[model samples]
Target: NCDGSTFVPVTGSAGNAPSKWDCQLLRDGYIAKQNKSWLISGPRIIGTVRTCQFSATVDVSGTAGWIGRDDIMDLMKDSLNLWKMQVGESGDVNCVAVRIAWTLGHS
Candidate 1:
């Protein structure tokens, strides 16, 4: 918890390593809630309905914060239940330590 604030994660850590940001569950939720607006454009516009879109930005701490091509594909298959897209089908998902570069923009 931050400054005595208690933030619990509904889903506990999986085989994936727990990130420091993961610990501040409330903080992560609050920040994601707030910055979600920043994600309103470009590649994030996938399929409209807004909610149907996935922000190129993901919250990962250090190296884990970055989503790779496989990671994005996994998320898409999990969410969309289809495989219309693939990594390197656009840009780098894990070229950096922890950041997802928009595929549309990287073009």
Candidate 2:
């Protein structure tokens, strides 16, 4: 909450700048709603984190490359192909969602 003016935490610099990964407990659909907001801080890919580990029990061992769904899907498909999985086996793959990330502004 803001006393007079609203403020957001520093998610690092955007626009072709190097991104730094940080841990965050993001609310579901946060990105989409933010896009609709009148405020001008649109979605920016500042950086990415190694994993989204909520706690010791819940560990999502992956990186958040992009907030876009289509892009993420392409990445996932490429990754599975790299592992030589589902090469010819055509099906749903018995999965819903998968995340793949590229080295954008990191080493």
Candidate 3:
């Protein structure tokens, strides 16, 4: 089951211009929907989690790179032919926790 591009709004954000927590759970919830079990005679996959293991740390200090599915599209659009490879194979662009980001270029 293939579909076009889609975007998810951040649940929230914070200091240093932060996009706050539960962001992991947000993606998990979204990914769970595509467990590919729903289409079968089996149950439409289990919804929700018993416990979500979310960890937060400094992503980068002027040194993180955008190399995620979401980030890839940004690259493709940011600089065409720079990056246009299909993600997870045949890039469906369903980036949940998978957006691309990188660099602090001023050179």
Candidate 4:
């Protein structure tokens, strides 16, 4: 279970910049949630991880180019909030619920 607070990476500075993979992950995570409607499932924690891996074709270099953990976290928080509003409080379900159901019944 992710509290969304503990897995933070070191913020990038001139001396402490992020890696190419870091930029890639942020780009992909934002993109994935950008598409599809809120009527669908919210962003997955796993989706963030998967998107972060090898999503960029080229290495995103430089301090200015790097996508920091703070940015990603912000987007994730928004996604989670939007999702919870629908599924958590309103009792409305989405594809994620369907996925959970599938997982419970399937191997």
Winner by TM-score:
1
Q: Which stretches of candidate 3 lie over 4 Å from their true place?
A: 13-36, 39-46, 51-107
Clash total of candidate 4: 1
Tens digits of per-residue lDDT, candidate 1, 29-59, equal 3323432223211234222121122345333
Alpha-carbon TM-score of each model against the true structure: 0.23, 0.20, 0.19, 0.22
Residue pairs of candidate 1 with colliding backbone atoms:
60-65
**lDDT for 69 (candidate 2):** 34
Question: How far out, in Å, is residue 2 in model 4?
Answer: 23
List the candidates ranked by lDDT, beginning with the highest: 1, 4, 3, 2
- How does candidate 3 fare on TM-score? 0.19
How much is 104 displaced in model 3, in angstroms?
A: 29
Greater TM-score among 1 and 2 belongs to 1
Q: Which ten residues in a row have the lowest lDDT in candidate 1?
A: 1-10
Candidates 2 and 4, the one with greater TM-score? 4
Top candidate by lDDT: 1
Model 1 gets an lDDT of 0.29
Clashing pairs in 3: 14-18, 65-101, 66-101, 66-102, 70-99, 70-100, 71-99, 71-100, 86-91, 87-91
Question: Which candidate, 3 or 4, would have the higher TM-score against the true structure?
Answer: 4
